[PDB]
Amino acid sequence: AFIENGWEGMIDGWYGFRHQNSEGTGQAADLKSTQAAIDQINGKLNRVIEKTNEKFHQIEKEFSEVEGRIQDLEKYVEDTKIDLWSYNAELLVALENQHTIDLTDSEMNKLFEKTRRQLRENAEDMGNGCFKIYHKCDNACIESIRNGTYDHDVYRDEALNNRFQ
């Protein structure tokens, strides 16, 4: 949110591309940037939701008979460590959701950098997350930038005659 809208029809990955040429249209998920993002997402899960439990003998936290100072001492520590774990839950999970939007923005920025390092003199941005290719780009040309095997010196003489002209 400068992406105007995503893609609802692409259900085979978190990221991808939408090609459009003379051979038709379609959507294809990027196998490089999607897998590189789940390793950062699932790495945040298994260090929080897995192997973070404590197995030990606790004490009585709820009492029916009011004794006095002995129950008033343990009630103040129990209400603190519940609120301290609740404050840490509002500190971790709210920052983990904040970092995940920054992670998807950084994975989009790395995808814009991987596409930007191959389309300097060959294409330009449009403003809605799309690149305006100034040369002929077939389905093999789309998969070259998707797999990271695109060549800049091959399509240099073709797109420069239509970029500034």
């Binding site: 259900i11 085979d12 998920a29 196998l31 999607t34 897998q35 789940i38 390793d39 997402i41 699932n42 790495g43 899960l45 298994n46 939701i49 897995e50």
Partner: protein, 229 residues
């Protein structure tokens, strides 16, 4: 627990058609990716195809060339590996594997095949040959004294021109097991398998101890016993 059970194997002719299966249990089949990796005899592993949960991203190997078709069904939790235009080179043991998905211990968000396949099944034997079921032909071997100072003599039996593999070969119905070596079957010019089995015995028990090489075949019910003397 997580376990993959394969099915659909058997004996077929070169040029037929089959449909393998990959029964999954213990996990959600609609969230993990599947593939098709075989193991050729005498060669290494070979990846063939790959499918996703959305059934839109389907890849094939260079040796497939559209001759195979891979499908799946979330209602039955199994695969549909269609085998068309087979030859003698495709005679191997097929396996189905589950992708890992992530680089952590437990992948709660399943990704792709970029971090190996930690789940493998038992597999089934798919033999592609035009030869029919044929009983084995047992040929004895006459021993002779070779080691002068040691005093040993080797003897065995030749199991040739049988189909299919394997044949459980023992000595004296399992009584003689010490020193028995089992050789693997090899392909002949006619396409039938052939192996052998020997047993290290001293030369003093040649004319006294009776060595009966027992040959038993399961699908043909052929039992030929030849005395080795």
């Amino acid at each position: 627990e997580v376990q993959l059970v394969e099915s659909g194997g058997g004996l077929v002719q070169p040029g037929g058609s089959l449909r393998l299966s990959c029964a999954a249990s213990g996990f959600t089949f609609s969230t993990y990716n599947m593939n098709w990796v075989r193991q050729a005899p005498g060669k290494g592993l070979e990846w063939l195809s790959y499918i996703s949960t959305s059934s839109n991203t389907i890849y094939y190997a260079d040796s497939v060339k559209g001759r195979f078709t891979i499908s799946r069904d979330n209602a039955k939790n199994s695969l549909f590996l269609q085998m068309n235009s087979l030859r003698d080179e495709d005679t191997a043991v097929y396996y189905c594997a589950r992708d890992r998905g992530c680089s952590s211990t437990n992948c709660y968000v399943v990704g792709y095949y970029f971090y190996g396949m930690d789940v493998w099944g038992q597999g089934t034997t798919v033999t592609v040959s035009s030869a029919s079921t044929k009983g084995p032909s047992v040929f004895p071997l006459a021993p002779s004294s070779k080691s002068t100072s040691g005093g040993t003599a080797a003897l065995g039996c030749l199991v040739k021109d049988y189909f299919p593999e394997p044949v459980t070969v023992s000595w004296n119905s399992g009584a003689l097991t010490s020193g028995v070596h089992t050789f693997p079957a090899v392909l002949q010019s006619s396409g039938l398998y052939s192996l052998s089995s020997v047993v290290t015995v001293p030369s003093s028990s040649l004319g006294t101890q009776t060595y009966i090489c027992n040959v038993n075949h399961k699908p043909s019910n052929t039992k030929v016993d030849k005395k080795v003397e």
